Ligand binder design. Structure first.
Ligand SMILES: O=P(O)(O)Cc1ccccc1
Length: 157
């Protein structure tokens, strides 16, 4: 059609709390703006710990509260992910180091690997792991993902 593709992979250690939240925050954003067709959106785990697992039910509750339904099956990052993705946006410092290790074990890294939290207007660098936190901690994570994802959509680093 002469009437009128980009990719982002959100990453944390397990792929059950934070990255699934970001992913569904970003998908909604592109979906509301009619541009989901132009975006490839996904999330993944540096580790194998959670493979096959749905998102954390505490984080799923936070998302239901905010209208945003999460359907994601935990998977571990692959070599292809680095070759196929434009951005790989991770939560914490230990994610980023682990991603960098991974990035030197592949031929082609098309991906910019970075902190999701480096798009924050409120300047909160790290999105911290709520695995041992509570619903306040999950709500804080969600809010951070909205800010960072909105800015990142606005225009990418
Ligand atoms: O999915 P996140 O946010 O990295 C937390 C997590 C969950 C399970 C195992 C390791 C880490």
């Amino acid at each position: 059609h002469m009437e009128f593709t980009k990719s982002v992979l959100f990453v944390c250690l397990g792929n059950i709390c934070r990255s699934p939240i970001a992913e569904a925050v970003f998908r909604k954003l592109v979906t509301d703006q009619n541009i989901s067709e132009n975006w490839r959106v996904d999330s993944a785990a540096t580790s194998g710990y959670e493979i096959g697992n749905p998102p954390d039910y505490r984080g799923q509750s936070c998302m239901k509260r905010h209208g945003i339904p999460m359907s994601h099956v935990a998977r571990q990052i692959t070599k292809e992910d680095f070759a196929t993705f434009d951005y790989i946006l991770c939560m914490d410092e230990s994610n980023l180091r682990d991603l960098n290790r991974k990035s030197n074990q592949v031929k082609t890294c098309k991906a910019k690997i970075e902190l999701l939290g480096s798009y924050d207007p409120q300047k909160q660098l790290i999105i911290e792991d709520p695995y041992y936190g509570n619903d306040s901690d999950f709500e804080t994570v969600y809010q951070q993902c909205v800010r960072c994802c909105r800015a990142f959509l606005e225009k990418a680093h």
